[PDB]
Design a protein around this ligand. Structure first.
Ligand SMILES: *P(=O)(O)OCC(C)(C)[C@@H](O)C(=O)NCCC(=O)NCCSC(=O)CCCCCCC
Length: 95
């Protein structure tokens, strides 16, 4: 797990990856929408995320990160943006 062997990226270079991840993640749980078109400043609320699909989103981006993530993930930081930051820290600060 953790394809992060490409480490050495600047914050935003990782963030863009992650903003694409979480978007592709959420767009998959709901089975809709081009992930590239998922706006970071928008809330998963608006994107169509409920409580059940919240965890599925986490599940997806957790499987794509290879680390372990709290079931309160989406409960605490719901946005494509906020997860981008959290997962960024999870990848750089945590190994
Ligand atoms: P969930 O418990 O699985 O949601 C199903 C629910 C709330 C019982 C139904 O009423 C329903 O499908 N309506 C959803 C309305 C909402 O906007 N609620 C979404 C999640 S409720 C909640 O607060 C869970 C924590 C997630 C916080 C971010 C809100 C998406």
């Amino acid at each position: 797990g953790s394809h992060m062997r490409l480490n050495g990226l600047s914050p935003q270079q990782q963030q863009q990856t992650l903003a694409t991840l979480v978007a592709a993640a959420t767009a998959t749980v709901l089975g809709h929408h081009t992930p590239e078109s998922i706006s970071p400043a928008t809330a998963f609320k608006d994107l169509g995320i409920d409580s059940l699909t919240a965890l599925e989103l986490r599940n997806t981006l957790t499987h794509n990160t290879g680390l372990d993530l709290p079931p309160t993930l989406i409960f605490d930081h719901p946005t494509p943006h906020a997860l981008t930051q959290h997962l960024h820290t999870r990848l750089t600060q945590s190994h």
